[PDB]
Write a protein that holds these residues in place. Structure first.
Motif, PDB file in Angstrom:
ATOM      1  N   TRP B  34       0.816  -1.212   0.000  1.00  0.00           N
ATOM      2  CA  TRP B  34       0.000   0.000   0.000  1.00  0.00           C
ATOM      3  C   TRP B  34       0.850   1.262   0.000  1.00  0.00           C
ATOM      4  O   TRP B  34       0.817   2.042  -0.954  1.00  0.00           O
ATOM      5  N   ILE B 132      -7.798   4.526  -9.599  1.00  0.00           N
ATOM      6  CA  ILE B 132      -9.039   3.895  -9.164  1.00  0.00           C
ATOM      7  C   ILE B 132      -8.990   2.387  -9.393  1.00  0.00           C
ATOM      8  O   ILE B 132      -9.470   1.609  -8.572  1.00  0.00           O
ATOM      9  N   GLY B 133      -8.398   1.982 -10.512  1.00  0.00           N
ATOM     10  CA  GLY B 133      -8.296   0.574 -10.850  1.00  0.00           C
ATOM     11  C   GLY B 133      -7.274  -0.166 -10.006  1.00  0.00           C
ATOM     12  O   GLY B 133      -7.548  -1.254  -9.499  1.00  0.00           O
ATOM     13  N   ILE B 135      -6.233   0.573  -7.105  1.00  0.00           N
ATOM     14  CA  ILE B 135      -6.722   0.510  -5.735  1.00  0.00           C
ATOM     15  C   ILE B 135      -7.745  -0.610  -5.550  1.00  0.00           C
ATOM     16  O   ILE B 135      -7.866  -1.163  -4.459  1.00  0.00           O
ATOM     17  N   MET B 136      -8.467  -0.950  -6.614  1.00  0.00           N
ATOM     18  CA  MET B 136      -9.393  -2.081  -6.569  1.00  0.00           C
ATOM     19  C   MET B 136      -8.657  -3.407  -6.717  1.00  0.00           C
ATOM     20  O   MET B 136      -8.971  -4.381  -6.035  1.00  0.00           O
ATOM     21  N   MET B 139      -7.233  -4.099  -3.727  1.00  0.00           N
ATOM     22  CA  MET B 139      -8.365  -4.164  -2.810  1.00  0.00           C
ATOM     23  C   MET B 139      -8.975  -5.558  -2.817  1.00  0.00           C
ATOM     24  O   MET B 139      -9.015  -6.231  -1.790  1.00  0.00           O
ATOM     25  N   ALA B 140      -9.454  -5.981  -3.982  1.00  0.00           N
ATOM     26  CA  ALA B 140     -10.153  -7.255  -4.114  1.00  0.00           C
ATOM     27  C   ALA B 140      -9.213  -8.460  -4.204  1.00  0.00           C
ATOM     28  O   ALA B 140      -9.669  -9.600  -4.293  1.00  0.00           O
ATOM     29  N   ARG B 141      -7.906  -8.211  -4.182  1.00  0.00           N
ATOM     30  CA  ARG B 141      -6.925  -9.294  -4.273  1.00  0.00           C
ATOM     31  C   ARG B 141      -5.824  -9.181  -3.218  1.00  0.00           C
ATOM     32  O   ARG B 141      -4.656  -8.974  -3.556  1.00  0.00           O
TER      33      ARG B 141
END
Ligand SMILES: CCCCCCCC(=O)OC[C@H](COP(=O)(O)OP(=O)(O)O)OC(=O)CCCCCCC
Ligand SMILES: CCCCCCCC(=O)OC[C@H](COP(=O)(O)OP(=O)(O)O)OC(=O)CCCCCCC
Ligand SMILES: CCCCCCCC(=O)OC[C@H](COP(=O)(O)OP(=O)(O)O)OC(=O)CCCCCCC
Ligand SMILES: CCCCCCCC(=O)OC[C@H](COP(=O)(O)OP(=O)(O)O)OC(=O)CCCCCCC
Ligand SMILES: [K+]
Ligand SMILES: [K+]
Ligand SMILES: [K+]
Ligand SMILES: [K+]
Ligand SMILES: [K+]
Ligand SMILES: [K+]
Lengths: 327, 327, 327, 327
Positions: B34, B132-133, B135-136, B139-141
């Motif tokens: 992060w 934005i991408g 961070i997802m 985020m989701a992985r």
């Protein structure tokens, strides 16, 4: 000398021709290249910026704003400070991007101009959202994902536990795991059925343990995949000398859910008859040092000769046992 | 005393070395931390803000704007109120972020300046979308997802329904389910084939019911996994005393689609020969209270002795039956 | 002449009626059409813009701002330059979109007005995020995805390797692969059990090799799927003449993980008894040219007659062998 | 009268207690409710708006801006028009949202103020991205997804094709399909092993055809699942009268990849011994009308009596055949 159906790197050697027709968005999106998709989106911005700019310019022209851009006590422009097409263009950009410097600013005077700002706001918002989504599509769905799985350069034929076997090695290049990993293999050759039907390439299963669930592997350090050559094997009748003659190909597959990419994966490779090493065994890649195990990947492809390996086919091997029993 | 191939917590004990090369974005993205990815993006903003700031400053310098930032009747600046590099820098930020306070404001005067605002608008938009991408993606992985599945600290050997069994317990720490859950086990030891080939760690299937589909489990309350020790078992010849001598390891696996994380999961653990408790049984964790069933997880790891358990191996058990039949 | 259960294109021919009730967001979202979802979002913008516009107008009205929009030394408006509903409406839009031209600008004067700007900022942000997400939902989850898999127009019955077989051809229209691809088939007809129970459509498995794992296919160039007609086949008793009489349907399935769409896929087709060609074989689509293999898809559906094909059923074929053995 | 392990609606009847500890973001995110997650994000905005507002206010205070907010010839404020905390607060909001009305506007005067605008810009951007992602997480991963699969209210026991069977009906409430759908069933009862071990709830497989692959279903119109009761069935010894006595439960499962939700699904239900209807058969739901097939779902749960059904257990049925053979 026939040809390669599947390349060593997994790529398939076939081209399709003469395909008929269908007269989708998500697939179409991920198929296009970055530079073209980014060019596409920048084109989308330009076009919409230019369009509304043109509209605000027309509105200004008809209202008489071009001659009184700042307005006065008796006269209020539709959009302040649109003095020509460049200004209208700027106001368009400033509106859709939502920069909104404010020197060029819409007024309450013209319903149509207010309407157009509403419309452009919605459009700009829609366009942005599509760009954010398309960028994720192409983002989370790349065509180039680096191969996470390695097959040995060669396969080999050697005795293991009293049985003549075809063997090849698979390995994971990452510390990441493969969930529900399993393996398959096929012998690829053309053949003619007894009824005279020609099959240009027949795909014949090579038994890696499917019936006992032993095709399922837990892959941490490299593993040697085993095909016992027996009555039911396509290689049953093949000897070491047949190998330097025969024209055929063996396709090896490893499937599983890669914990890294999150997607189900098929890793492929191929061994020509000439790429199979008879009477060889793989060098061990795995070593225990005190507190921990290590894999040395420089030994991954390496093999050594086992001269005691029988040079006859498995069928000869079996038949010979039955020949020296009875006598 | 050999060593641990798989840790109790599922972590694999191997390190890879001497790996060759490849000369992807989505994987690369989720692999970075992060603080570094956020530092990265903030760096991306700074660089682009500074760059365009520099460009607007050059434009202003050459146009003569630095000496007339507000302009007058005879002179119009390219961008209003750029009086130096700090101002140009601000105008850059204000443009790309789309804050657009408007004190510093582009004019219709210079095609190049208008062009640069268009370009920066597109770039700022592209950068945002990538942030934005990414961070997802991260985020989701996530790499740290909390283990949702528990294995008992020990396995055990005891009689069930006339059969000597290896047993271990699995459980779901969440009310969430596991779709198409199934289990596997392996005995891990080095071995030498009759042909003299050394296998540093051989992975030998432990039959948990695959052939009847009984390896498939519906997991609500903790379940005790069963391996019947028989002719075909690697443990067939192992007695209680062999256990305190033998050096080997049993890896246990549970795979399935976790309804929480939405992703296919592999939960792992390990039992050393020394971690197997002979003549023991697990304490029941499940209890019915009137209208409802409850699981007490403080009993999950607990076991009790069953002194009537035979101390000989399964092979002895079988052979002895055939010895007292005939006589 | 009964009817089609599954259409040639895979569409199922059934309609549901008289369904009971349930009194979700993600499914609901992807089910709605673009134009309606975009209309929906634009409606969401309008409503929120109009609402806050109304609120700022009320605030302005009560504060006395309508009569002093720019304020003066003794008087400060809640929001500068709200002179009526159109102005309030503009200020609302300019605030929520974050355009913020700034001619209409909130002041420090009224706590309520400041509050309302905070609220609208949060709402506008929430709305945008929902639009970005919904657009991806409908984006990555389309209902129209172009069929990536082709079934031959006809099936056929012919001898292969001493056995009478039902055969049909499957193919991949893309260079993209199918992971863990496998096939199935069913004979669909109504039937009455010996106990007198009527089954409107019974679905009876057609064996494509499931027990040996041979239903699993590696699909590169088109492959011919084989059903050996034997004692255990529903077609065992069917001859060529029975075919022009019998009323039945065969449904063929191909399942797998499409590497393009990333999602598990079920491709379907159907063959009526009248669409099965007895004593026919498919034209070869695969050809080797020097360095490479090619598939000619214009031959995909084509077949040729094999007059030597027996016209009796498989059962007759078997029974006749046993009839000429004994005599 | 024991109790329900799985509810008719699929919900599991167990509660966990006394769980130990772990000292993730994506799971944590989707687990929280909307109103709380939206409250959370609005809290995130407020806090960051208030924080920077405080900072700009301090900067203004120390610089002497509060007494000269608009500046003059000899004096330039760090941020124009910050006259107090409310103004600073507004400037913060206007900056982070990127509204940027511009009445309050940063200047080139103070490096720290410029720095703070840069920082807040980055933070505001980060916050937004996290909100867009979290909203998709909770969006594409709902806990409430409407059950897409229906089980009949009752199971039944009747003869089919010479065999006594346990039967229950499954159906798809949507036109959408289920990929690689398959079924399972379990008999749930407590039991004591011959060795005296108590198993609070034992889960015993009910054979639905797994070994022949017949547990795999192609589900369009409702299908009746069949369990042949034979030597290997847990119900082998159960007669109609045993049913009104016995305490046990049958759990039925349907798993598959739902083409609607895109995710692998487990649909569950349960039949108590008292919910099984002996000597009954389901009413047909499927009907052919000319050009098309229809399903009437009001018949889904309905059954009718078959008085010719034997009332003895399958074991009696078998044993009686062998009793009238020999005599
Ligand atoms: C003149 C060409 C300028 C330009 O468009 O290059 C784009 C670059 C080129 O990619 P390319 O099109 O070669 O890749 P494909 O062959 O797979 O399509 O692709 C990025 O990574 C953009 C990442 C943007 C990341 C922004 C945030 C750091
Ligand atoms: C000085 C370091 C400042 C800083 O960057 O910390 C980031 C923090 C640290 O995470 P860390 O890098 O330790 O995690 P990994 O080891 O897995 O990479 O990670 C967040 O959750 C950010 C959530 C942001 C959520 C914003 C909306 C509430
Ligand atoms: C009057 C109707 C105006 C209008 O709304 O058309 C929308 C269009 C129509 O789609 P349609 O509703 O027919 O498709 P479905 O039947 O599947 O729902 O769908 C887009 O692709 C929008 C892509 C927007 C892409 C923006 C960036 C280039
Ligand atoms: C006072 C409570 C105000 C408020 O926060 O309600 C939120 C609502 C309530 O949802 P709730 O929290 O009950 O659902 P869960 O129990 O599953 O968590 O959830 C939305 O759909 C928001 C959709 C927003 C869509 C915006 C674009 C149209
Ligand atoms: K703005
Ligand atoms: K903005
Ligand atoms: K402004
Ligand atoms: K089997
Ligand atoms: K799967
Ligand atoms: K602005």
């Amino acid at each position: 000398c026939r040809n390669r159906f599947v390349k060593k790197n997994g790529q398939c050697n076939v081209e399709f021709t003469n395909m008929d027709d269908k007269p989708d968005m998500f697939t179409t999106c991920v198929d296009i290249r970055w530079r073209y998709m980014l060019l596409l989106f920048s084109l989308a911005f330009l076009v919409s910026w230019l369009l509304f700019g043109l509209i605000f310019w027309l509105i200004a022209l008809i209202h008489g704003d071009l001659e009184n851009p700042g307005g006065d006590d008796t006269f209020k422009p539709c959009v302040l400070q649109v003095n020509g097409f460049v200004a209208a263009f700027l106001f368009s950009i400033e509106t859709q991007t939502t920069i909104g410097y404010g020197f060029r600013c819409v007024t309450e005077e013209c319903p149509l101009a207010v309407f157009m700002v509403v419309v452009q706001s919605i459009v700009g918002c829609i366009i942005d959202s599509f760009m954010i989504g398309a960028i994720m599509a192409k983002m989370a769905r790349p065509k180039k994902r680096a191969q996470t799985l390695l097959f040995s350069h060669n396969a080999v034929v050697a005795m293991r536990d009293g049985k003549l076997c075809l063997m090849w090695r698979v390995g994971n290049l990452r510390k990441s795991h493969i969930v529900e990993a399993h393996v398959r293999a096929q012998l690829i050759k053309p053949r003619i059925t007894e009824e005279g039907e020609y099959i240009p390439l027949d795909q014949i299963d090579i038994d890696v343990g499917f019936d006992k669930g032993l095709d399922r592997i837990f892959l941490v350090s490299p593993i040697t995949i085993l095909h016992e050559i027996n009555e039911d094997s396509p290689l049953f009748g093949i000897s070491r000398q047949d190998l330097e003659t025969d024209d055929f190909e063996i396709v090896v597959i490893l499937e599983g859910m890669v914990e890294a990419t999150a997607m189900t994966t098929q890793a492929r490779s191929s061994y020509l008859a000439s790429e199979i090493l008879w009477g060889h065994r793989f060098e061990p890649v795995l070593f225990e040092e005190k507190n921990q195990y290590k894999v040395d990947y420089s030994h991954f492809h390496k093999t050594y000769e086992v001269p005691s390996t029988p040079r006859c086919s498995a069928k000869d091997l079996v038949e010979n046992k039955f020949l020296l029993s009875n006598s």
